[PDB]
Symmetry: D2
Subunit: 304 residues, 4 copies
Amino acid sequence: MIARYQTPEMARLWSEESRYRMWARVEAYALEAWEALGEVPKGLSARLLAKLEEKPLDGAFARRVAELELVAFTRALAEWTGDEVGRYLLGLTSSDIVDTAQNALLVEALGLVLEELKGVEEALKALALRHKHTPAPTSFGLRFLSFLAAFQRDEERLKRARETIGVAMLSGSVGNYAHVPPEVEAHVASRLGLRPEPLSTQVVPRDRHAEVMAALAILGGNIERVAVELRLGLENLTGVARLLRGYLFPALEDIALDISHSVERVILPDATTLAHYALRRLKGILEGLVFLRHVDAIYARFGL
Amino acid sequence: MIARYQTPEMARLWSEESRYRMWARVEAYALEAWEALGEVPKGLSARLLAKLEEKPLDGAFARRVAELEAVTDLVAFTRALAEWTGDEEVGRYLHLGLTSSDIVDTAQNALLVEALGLVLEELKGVEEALKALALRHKHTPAIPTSFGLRFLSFLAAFQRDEERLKRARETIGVAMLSGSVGNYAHVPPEVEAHVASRLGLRPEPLSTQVVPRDRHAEVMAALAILGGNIERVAVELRHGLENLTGVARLLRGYLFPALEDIALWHEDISHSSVERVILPDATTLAHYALRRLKGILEGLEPFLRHVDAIYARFGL
Amino acid sequence: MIARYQTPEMARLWSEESRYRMWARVEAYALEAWEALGEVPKGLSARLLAKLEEKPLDGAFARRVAELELVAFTRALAEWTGDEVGRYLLGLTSSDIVDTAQNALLVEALGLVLEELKGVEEALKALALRHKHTPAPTSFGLRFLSFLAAFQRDEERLKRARETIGVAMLSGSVGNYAHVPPEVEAHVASRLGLRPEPLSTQVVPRDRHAEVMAALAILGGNIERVAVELRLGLENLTGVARLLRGYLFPALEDIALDISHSVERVILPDATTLAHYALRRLKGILEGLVFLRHVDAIYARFGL
Amino acid sequence: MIARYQTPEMARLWSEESRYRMWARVEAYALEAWEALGEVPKGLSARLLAKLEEKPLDGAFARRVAELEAVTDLVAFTRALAEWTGDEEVGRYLHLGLTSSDIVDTAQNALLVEALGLVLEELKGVEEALKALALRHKHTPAIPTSFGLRFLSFLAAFQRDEERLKRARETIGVAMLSGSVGNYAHVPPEVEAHVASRLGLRPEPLSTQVVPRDRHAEVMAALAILGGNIERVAVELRHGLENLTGVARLLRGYLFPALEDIALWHEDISHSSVERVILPDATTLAHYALRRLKGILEGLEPFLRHVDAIYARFGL
């Protein structure tokens, strides 16, 4: 995604470095649970976490991994902490590590989109109150309340998408816990603020990703609506809405299937970052913006 | 839609006759509320409702509306309804503040709530067939695993579609009877509240001229994710099904216009093809695909240390 | 497709009855070629064609086929002419018959879309000439010339789509002519105004259908442009443009694969009929519609 | 786009540096035409062109444009170009009737002609690999047929993509230097004709402020059909390839905004993300997928009475 349509928070969240740090946390929390089960020496996971706190994974780690090209990553992780750790990375698959980390990242990304949505929601509330008794014959305020009601529906949809995607898969080769006790997954889930994936195969099911992307595409349409109604930088918000519709189509195709889903490396980071960018741009525009006898009853439905 | 890929329930639900019957119920229930407010003579609303139970609007009523439309859509409909009931006293009391959109959007939301009920019924059928195959195959070894686990993966995905479709049904299940600009200037909120309750809907807490189209887009999006879960079963079974795969492609195509309609339907109810095509077609294809998939699943009939526990998360 | 957005020409072309009549023509022309090769009694194909000319396949034929539910169709065809014909229907597959007939129908449908496009092209030419020296400071005429140039590009794209789709497959079970001499296909192609499909499998390749649908989606966008620029019944033309974009996506997915492509029964008839409807509606709107020193050089590029 | 799914040729072509170099060529060639018309001093255009050969615009030039943009895009670019050449005499002679869109759309069409050349080169590589596998397998029996025929089906489909991509390249290969409203009021048609010829393009026979976006949509549509033919090979080989299937899904997604842009880009060149994302991404993914597919085909290595004749339609 080109820098003009990026937020600093999304650029950091979706960087190489941030993915490796999340991978490392999954590995460390898994080791911690194996330790409770007698399968890794006491103190090995505390040592990896202490060392990550002291020397966070950065560009030099990421370049170093791009050379050895999860074997490359685990070698680079053991080498970059100078450590035993190598032998104990035991039953988990690549997909367990990578899909769990991506879920964690997507939970964070949706938290950023919700934070900005709340800003747009607050600006529309304020505009709707300010213009509650402004004549237009109707209240000019009702228009902003219509936007608010749509964004509140988007909030509900984005919170449900966040609950659906917030799962940890640490289930081993075919997803039946033969090589990794369910306790490992339960522990890693808990440490990441996720819940255990109640039924995984080799992968997390992609109806979960599709609900996230569909929530973003519906949010884009509501951003578009405000922008088209305001035109009383809106080529920008309509542009983002078209990309969000485009990005949804590969996620809908990914439902049926392994890894045939390039696709997620592009669409999840790009749609979450365009959503964040667009709501921030829309908040700025709303902050700098300019027969009635049932208006109070209508406002009351929104506690206004 | 082609008779080959319809269900009798969706063919009836989305028929013209069915639409006019729902237009008529919306006018009737509105009349009842207007009666209670002393704006229509006592016993009229109840006489219209008894006439529409006694002589259901059918094909002959639909032809009359079509003829009348050649020469004007709700003028044509209200005039056919007056003439078909045989009571021109009703005629003055229709549209008494209600817009075309109040009737058409309200009736379409009631039809969409029903259509989603039919899809949820058939999804329940698909869920029970998947519980049956998972129970049958719980101890069946395959490649070194329980063959049954695959059916539980399908089941979990369709239980999420079920939650998604129940939320879409709650979101779409709104009545708009708010008059010209949606501010109740010419129609007191009690009319909308009474018609909503009589239809099993809730009031649209804020309409413009139209119900907001993020509600419609949530429905079409739920159906497209469902289509993917239907497709996923058909593909994993391939290892009939060309049909289920086909429906999934059409459901993805039909979603695109609903996503464009969000920004765009309040500048269509009357002059645009988009919703007349995609909402009956997407709901019909979903119902059809779930029925066909249910038929196919019903036709079908040491390393496993954790299978009992996995099955217990599903209550199996 | 609902009647409001149908043309009479497209309703007839895409009816059950019209499909059966095209099926029967493919069968008859195949018999004619087998006859030249000594494989069917002389005069059998002339007898089937004579009988079809005299009693064209109609509702009573179509209902009669919907009962016996290409076995049903061939029985119903032999029964409905009271005839030998049964035994001689020999090497051709269902797909040979059905895919060849659908190509023929799509060539006709594209001929209808081109006929209406020429009407829109003529109206824009006329409007551009009428307003060539009308000031707006620029010629008000140039706007109509921009529309014309786009529609002329659509014409070129729709004529190329018509050439790509205009193929006949009569190649037998796996497409290698083992059970049907290439002469049969060459003869049927010639009789239908098609060319032989130079390389078929069990089916005609679907990049051909996808080019047709993509041409229609690009035509829809240009119809949309005129409608949005005119708003100086256009919810109708913008609506059709959204359906044409939607219909393209299943045809793009159909490229890769057998018959997993319901999909074509819906999208080919619906997109060709919405295209025909929309251009006819757009022609009617254009017919009833209201610094300069290089205008003549610009008009000259279009021979105006 | 991610380095994993790029080619070195597309990474260079779509770089900022590459865009600024093409902006600079468009300004230079326009200056030459303005010189011939006696509106810029003799030898200036030729001195700018020799300076841009002697000191190619690189990363340091791009940083300067970015800094300058923080404080205004073509003011920032024309000011960086004046300062980087060391000649403020040039500065007065830039934008001398040319719009931002004349430069930006013209440069983007020249980059799109190159990008399509790279895709066509790599498609030629895929075609030769398919001719090789068809020749190898001409007499190889499979299931009762020639195994080689399958490669000829792939080849025929990619020969159609080739025709489609050459037509898309002709359609996009237009120069717009027509000034404010596209009527040449402030820039004589000889400027556009001279820059077109110097770029290997033809004049846009009728522009507004912008090149019409059916041209861009034809390009994106050709790439999405190509993606389907790439996908079809990967799926029929499955019977690596998750990668080629992945690219086909993104190419279908990227097309949707280009189809919406037709009605819609002349009310974006400057304030919208859509083309900055989809045109470099779709052309890069196509080039990448064709290169990967070519590597894989190169790695790979009585009822047949009509095979020689079928092969002869392909000249094999």
